[PDB]
Curated annotation (Swiss-Prot), chain B:
This is Vimentin. It comes from Homo sapiens. Highly expressed in fibroblasts, some expression in T- and B-lymphocytes, and little or no expression in Burkitt's lymphoma cell lines. Expressed in many hormone-independent mammary carcinoma cell lines. It comes from the Eukaryota. Transmembrane segments: none annotated. The lineage of its organism: Eukaryota, Metazoa, Chordata, Craniata, Vertebrata.
Amino acid sequence: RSVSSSSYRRMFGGPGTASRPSSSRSYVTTSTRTYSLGSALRPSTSRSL
Amino acid sequence: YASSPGGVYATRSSAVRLRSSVPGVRLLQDSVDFSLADAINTEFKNTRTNEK
């Protein structure tokens, strides 16, 4: 009277990994390198010459 | 006069394909360009320009 379990309740792995998508946020977060040309936008020159 | 301080732009991140379900409780954004308000920030200041 030895128990005869094969795979016996189907065969398919475990419940068990529906492959939840690991997005590439293992990249570096972007360089926010914008620039303000705050000086030339007021052309400060003596026309008194 | 330089654009993109530090060389910055939105470089592609793409990670491990984690299949999380996310039930997506929205913050709705009534400021999807509330912009009429920022043209109005320029008119809260055109109103100052006409008075001046």
